[PDB]
Write a protein that binds this ligand. Structure first.
Ligand SMILES: C=CC(C)(C)OC[C@H]1O[C@H](O[C@@H]2C3=C([C@H](C)COC(C)=O)C[C@H](O)[C@]3(C)/C=C3/[C@@H](COC)CC[C@H]3[C@@H](C)[C@H]2O)[C@H](O)[C@@H](OC(C)=O)[C@@H]1O
Ligand SMILES: C=CC(C)(C)OC[C@H]1O[C@H](O[C@@H]2C3=C([C@H](C)COC(C)=O)C[C@H](O)[C@]3(C)/C=C3/[C@@H](COC)CC[C@H]3[C@@H](C)[C@H]2O)[C@H](O)[C@@H](OC(C)=O)[C@@H]1O
Ligand SMILES: [Cl-]
Ligand SMILES: [Cl-]
Lengths: 236, 6, 236, 6
């Protein structure tokens, strides 16, 4: 690893600098180096890891969607043949995206998940595993698409089970997990009713737990609840 | 709107 | 070159796809491949080249400024020592930025400029040469800072001389050249009076030539004139 | 405002 010679603390410090500079590829390489030191990650360090890769893969996914829409338009009735370039470049972006997903999944599997015993870390990493299998599923088209989908489902479900037993309904990780598993149901698993049921039940159960919270915790929870509401308004 | 994920 | 096996026309086609996807690093690699085919570039192809690298180096420069401001704050009176990381990461970004500038300058020198005979291509490439020496000058601090500055000046001046003899005052390339040479005067050469004089004279001479233009050309020219006005309003 | 260049 190109980060093997740098101190763990320096990698974390530089990941925070990269965040401030919106250099998310750098931020992700720094946090990968930090994970590969072999020590567990703190709460703040897990957030740095997730934010870095979320932004890297988020830009790749947006580019892939632009290119895939061009590709699909080029295969409509009446489109002039333009050669293999659109497909080639879509494939190039797709392959780079899959490489990032594989790298994150490899960090989770070696060895973040197996050492995560507290609910907040275990649920967090299983949500990530679900998320990156979901991004693979968004571009999948071959023999293993169903297994990719089921891997996303399985990881989200284990995280859901732990979060329901071990975290209050307003916990931001629990809420963000439910938000994304709902999106998975809606547009990956062809289960819009499940997506709507999960978003509503999650929102209503958080609502009823807000009275237990401090002002700051209230703000943290309501922010993600509003994203659940946004999706319900879009989907109904 | 693009649906929300986190 | 990793692009040596791809057709020139496919590189141009993929550069346009990368632009649409805001993948400017890809766009720049595609256009570098196109230049290295050894054929001159058309008007549209020159714009693809300039836009790609402008955006790549623009993000690098913005990150460098974030990091350099953190670095400077860390050297103020009363700041707790934080170690070498801020300097190291600023240096990392700076070095990558300089590499991009060197790559563009190398394309211009091998062999875009020496084959550019029409005013519109020669002025365009000499503006680029000025621009990328200016970006090197923004981060320069050693024995050769003065030579870097003078290289920017020399390239801008040759472009100014040709543009004044061969292009009308409203030509967008002439206007964009004057805008940037004015910025060079203001913040690189410590000559704010020259910056203001050049911006005003350029704006006034374009104003008086607008009556010769079509509606579309009028819109193209007034757009860049407004940027000259923006700077005059900021600087006076 | 950040001065304008093109
Ligand atoms: C990258 C690190 C920084 C920017 C320093 O922190 C990111 C953020 O880290 C925390 O927020 C987390 C968090 C997010 C908050 C909902 C965003 O808060 C905002 C916009 O103000 C989004 C981030 O991506 C992050 C880290 C992600 C997760 C997500 C992880 O799945 C694996 C599940 C839910 C959410 C949880 C972990 C949030 O607690 C904090 O509570 C946030 O602070 C405030 C005032 O909201 C901070 O912006
Ligand atoms: C990247 C290619 C695309 C996006 C297809 O074209 C970029 C642009 O290419 C042309 O515009 C050029 C041009 C710019 C125009 C002023 C921007 O027009 C807008 C915002 O609508 C900015 C671009 O960077 C570009 C290519 C750069 C130069 C600059 C080059 O220095 C080496 C000097 C001045 C300016 C000239 C070359 C402009 O003519 C066109 O006139 C623009 O079309 C319109 C309607 O304005 C188009 O957006
Ligand atoms: Cl490609
Ligand atoms: Cl570094």
């Amino acid at each position: 690893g190109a980060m093997g010679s740098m101190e763990r603390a320096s990698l974390i410090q530089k990941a925070k600098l990269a965040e401030q500079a919106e250099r998310y590829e750098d931020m992700a390489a720094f946090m990968k180096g930090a994970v590969e030191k072999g020590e567990e990650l703190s709460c703040e360090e897990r957030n740095l890891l997730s934010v870095a890769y979320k932004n890297v893969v988020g830009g790749q996914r947006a580019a892939w969607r632009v290119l895939s829409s061009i590709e699909q338009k080029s295969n409509e009735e009446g489109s002039e043949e333009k050669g293999p370039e659109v497909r080639e470049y879509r494939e190039k972006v797709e392959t780079e995206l899959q490489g990032v997903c594989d790298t994150v999944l490899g960090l989770l599997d070696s060895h973040l998940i197996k050492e995560a015993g507290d609910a907040e870390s275990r649920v967090f990493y299983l949500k990530m595993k679900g998320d990156y299998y979901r991004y693979l599923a968004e571009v999948a088209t071959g023999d293993d698409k169903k297994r990719i989908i089921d891997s996303a489902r399985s990881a989200y479900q284990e995280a859901m089970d732990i979060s329901k037993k071990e975290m209050p309904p307003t916990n931001p990780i629990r809420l963000g997990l439910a938000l994304n598993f709902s999106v998975f149901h809606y547009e990956i698993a062809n289960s819009p009713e499940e997506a709507i049921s999960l978003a509503k039940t999650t929102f209503d159960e958080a609502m009823a737990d807000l009275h237990t919270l401090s002002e700051d915790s209230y703000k943290d929870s309501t922010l993600i609840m509003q994203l659940l509401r946004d999706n319900l308004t879009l989907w109904t | 709107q693009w649906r929300k994920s986190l």
